[PDB]
Design a binder for these strands. Sequence first.
DNA 1: GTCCCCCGCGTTTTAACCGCCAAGGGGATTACTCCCTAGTCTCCAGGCACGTGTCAGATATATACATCCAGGCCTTGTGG
Length: 113
Amino acid sequence: APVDPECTAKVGKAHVYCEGNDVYDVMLNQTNLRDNNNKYYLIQLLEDDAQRNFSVWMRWGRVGKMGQHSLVACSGNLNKAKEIFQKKFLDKTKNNWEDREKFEKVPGKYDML
DNA sequence: GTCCCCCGCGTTTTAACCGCCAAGGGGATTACTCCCTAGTCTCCAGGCACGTGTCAGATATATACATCCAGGCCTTGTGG
């Protein structure tokens, strides 16, 4: 699970956060030709190399382009960093993060992977 | 590709088509009677044959505008 190359502030000094099979890196996509959507939303929880500190990287756009982005620094609070990551995933997919092993598709929402 | 006009056909009904009975308008016929234009011969000027030169406009000529073909920015719209 690589750090997004567009996250240039963290790519040289951080890695994707993981615990066992629970890997906090996910790409989401909404392709719909009736509405003419073809947009992605990336979410990555990052941990710094030098210290026990965290940030949620996020990036969006139409597939093949950039839209806007965000890097939410969490000041060593992993619970806050996970809550931000999981809330954005839930809002975009209408699935809980604990349901990732049994994910189900929803109209007017992003698909996963 | 898809919007909908016109093709085909059941039900309703009125005015086109059918019988024949009236009144008289107006086209056809035969008769009246003098007005119209063909026909004669003579006069003469409208109109045509043909000299001749003014002046319209074609032929340049130098010049100023109309409008076609690239070549070149600013505001409103779609999706995020």
